[PDB]
Ligand binder design. Structure first.
Ligand SMILES: COC(=O)c1ccccc1S(=O)(=O)NC(=O)N(C)c1nc(C)nc(OC)n1
Ligand SMILES: COC(=O)c1ccccc1S(=O)(=O)NC(=O)N(C)c1nc(C)nc(OC)n1
Lengths: 349, 349
């Protein structure tokens, strides 16, 4: 069912700062080709879209895309089925979707000169990085190697091109500045729930420690674990005995303690190996990253928290990739999110 | 006013191509940091959003942002009033809004290495260009100089930060590939109307010559004029005796003739001078650019066309900037667009 009734919708920019070029601007001189002379540039701002149902119930949801993505992933699946934006407006929540600084409609800070460089100042690095189709295939656990699917896969097969086309690079904007933009959004919205994904997992945890308005977190397949400073537990290397997972983020315990004050759920899909898998780097990476997250959640619970790990196969959902909210069974994944919101009173006024 | 009812909404990717790096991808080797080795990259694809009303009447509208912009400008004004997307869904048209290749949710083609470079191939230039706040202020005719506003201005004053935050750079993707993506969208949608803006004006004219499904064009403040090859009329230089407008695009006459088969309207806002203005480069640039467009429309009409130029002040609307569809009187601007659609039956089934 695709129909949606909106009391209002729209979009806006929030957050960011400015940087200035040298000299002054003279309106009599040729304006194009564009010059840094006399220039003010707005940088690192974030794009925000919202859709509000008639008579909303409970708190607004803020859907935060993973690494190299945009709010598209919450709008539609690669095969054109409704995304979580539609499903949760239908579930009577106001829905915010963002393009964080450096991605999509967010700002990419570059000027007149080599990419990212404002005269002698490097705002972001000129050298970029970006996953290939092959790297993303294994990262997202479509299968163990590019072009191969797990038998049980929930991926919308045949729509591979559409899926990979949604992904791209991110300039080297500091995570501090990304977190700052979302803190400002949360201040603007009021009490809300963060729904994060992969690279935005750790960022949403950070936002919650800075913003009391974050009343809950659901994180799909978070990519970086978080611990109190100096209390990082022993985490093994990968099965190749050379690689490590992403270095866990460390925060002062007084901020970490704030995570114990709200319900937090991490959600993982399928096909994460239980045992070392030296032949398949990313499968093994996910094994150890999921383990690190289990210890992070345990640390929150030892501070009086209510932090849980939901493995979708234990709820009867088999074959999900690292994007469960765009997989073929995404309605069932959404149902489990609604269950979490309902259990914690986040769907009541 | 804000209420919107959608039979369906969503988004998708269309267009683009692939490129690779050398070698073979080995899933046993560390996937991050990402490498070009064995890597397929999707480049130059376009993001498309659609909103369909219940029982649409007439043709879908494709709103195409100007230079350095995104579909945001059709979603909301800088001060948060409804954009043309909402207004035209309320007007019972299905509405498509795009982020063209190189902008917003469209692809920015960069890899592992200096920006835009895939090994020894330069996909886009590493050196970027980008307007400043000051350049955009005068380009868009908010006032003759930054900080100043024309009398009777329709700009949402006070929302300068929101407005300028929506603008950014474009990588050097060829115009051929941008046009190609929209031709593919037009094939997918069927008969439709293009609504263009500034830098997308000439691109929409080009699309129409390649796509019979374009049944009409409304272009707000187009930036580059178009003529049959070898038939560009004499166009004077600017009042500074040294600058010229953008070199007009020249197409083969057999393609130019296709513009004579559909209704085409160019729409200009206020404060374009009638006489040379050496003190204000962009005001004088608009004077001569608008003149060049008058001659382009005349050439279309000489070939049997239905091309017209609408100056908003002659229709009783004073003070519009170069973004009339986000100005304070944008509802009245929308009413004139509805009038055009109705005149030509583009609002009937
Ligand atoms: C949608 O996919 C993801 O969100 C994702 C998931 C797992 C691993 C890496 C990424 S990533 O593709 O974004 N990572 C990335 O681009 N890089 C390169 C990255 N990201 C992070 C968060 N840390 C590090 O190194 C510490 N690298
Ligand atoms: C939203 O504003 C515009 O759409 C716009 C409007 C008028 C002039 C220039 C631009 S522009 O900012 O895009 N131009 C631009 O960035 N440059 C640099 C440009 N664009 C074009 C289409 N041609 C040329 O040179 C021929 N330069």
């Amino acid at each position: 069912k695709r129909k949606v009734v909106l009391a209002e919708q729209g979009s806006f920019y929030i957050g960011g700062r400015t940087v200035t070029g040298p000299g002054k601007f003279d309106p009599s001189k040729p304006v194009i080709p564009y010059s840094n002379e006399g220039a003010t540039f707005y940088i690192n701002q974030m794009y925000v879209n919202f859709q509000a149902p008639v008579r909303p119930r409970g708190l607004p949801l803020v859907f935060w895309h993973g690494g190299g993505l945009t709010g598209h992933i919450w709008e539609s699946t690669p095969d054109g089925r409704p995304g979580f934006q539609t499903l949760f407006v239908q579930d009577r929540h106001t829905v915010y979707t963002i393009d964080q600084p450096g991605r999509g409609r967010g700002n990419i800070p570059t000027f007149n000169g080599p990419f990212g460089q404002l005269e002698e100042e490097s705002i972001v690095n000129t050298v970029t990085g970006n996953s290939s189709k092959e790297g993303a295939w294994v990262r997202d656990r479509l299968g163990p190697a590019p072009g191969q699917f797990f038998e049980n896969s929930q991926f919308p097969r045949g729509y591979e091109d559409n899926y990979f086309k949604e992904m791209g690079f991110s300039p080297s904007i500091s995570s501090d500045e990304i977190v700052d933009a979302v803190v400002k959004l949360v201040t603007h919205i009021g009490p809300c729930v963060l729904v994060t994904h992969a690279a935005s997992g750790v960022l949403g945890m950070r936002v919650a420690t800075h913003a009391k308005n974050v009343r809950g977190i659901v994180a799909y397949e978070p990519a970086t674990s978080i611990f109190p400073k100096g209390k990082v537990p022993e985490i093994p290397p990968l099965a190749d005995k050379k690689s490590q997972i992403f270095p866990p983020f460390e925060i002062q315990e007084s901020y970490f303690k704030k995570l114990a004050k709200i319900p937090i759920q991490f959600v993982f899909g399928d096909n994460i190996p239980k045992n070392p898998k030296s032949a398949y780097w990313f499968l093994d990476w996910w094994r150890v990253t999921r383990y690190a997250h289990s210890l992070s959640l345990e640390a929150i619970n030892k501070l009086g928290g209510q932090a849980s790990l939901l493995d979708l196969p234990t709820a009867g959902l088999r074959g999900n990739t690292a994007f469960p909210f765009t997989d073929r069974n995404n309605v069932q994944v959404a149902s489990l999110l609604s269950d979490f919101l309902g259990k914690h009173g986040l769907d009541q006024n």
